[PDB]
Amino acid sequence: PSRLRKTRKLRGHVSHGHGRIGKHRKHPGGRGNAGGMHHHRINFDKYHPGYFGKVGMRHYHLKRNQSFCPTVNLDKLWTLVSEQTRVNAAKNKTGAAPIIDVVRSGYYKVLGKGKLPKQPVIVKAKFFSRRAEEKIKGVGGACVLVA
Template structure:
């Protein structure tokens, strides 16, 4: 409820808890990820290591799953075939 909020207590106090030197201005540190190279470098290095700089070799036209080759266990191969097909295969052995 609004009667319990801090702003009620701060009525009559000029700077409203934001100090008189630095003041409460719009975005003093910049918005979002701004300042990662200078003012916020410590935070970036600490919590997001590797955010800047390049590493590794670039592969230009990468085709994923090219080497995809699912394995089949030969012992269980006939479990994938219906019983009718198994009977037909047994008759047509050449």
């Protein structure tokens, strides 16, 4: 909508909302990211700290699939398997624990953030954190490794 805009309310004025002294000239600061170490240094220092310079090692042919390891917390570990299993786990008499194949749902590591509800599990996760191990052992479960 061109009619809702500021351009329509600037018909009848003169400078069109770009100053009478400092006129709307073409590029009075240089084009793009110019003067980043010269006359736009203070903007870059105050708002983009670290912009200039190198750090760390160059890795030439980086493929993003070699370093693929999507993580799930213990906070939402039970949401991977149906709500029926968590119901059927507690009520039944045997003491059989349900299996949460974390790789089936599309995560390769189990991090240990949430309070894990006090009933056993067997977690077939590809990787584990040290806490995520301790939480499952504490509730009374298995940290089954898989590849």
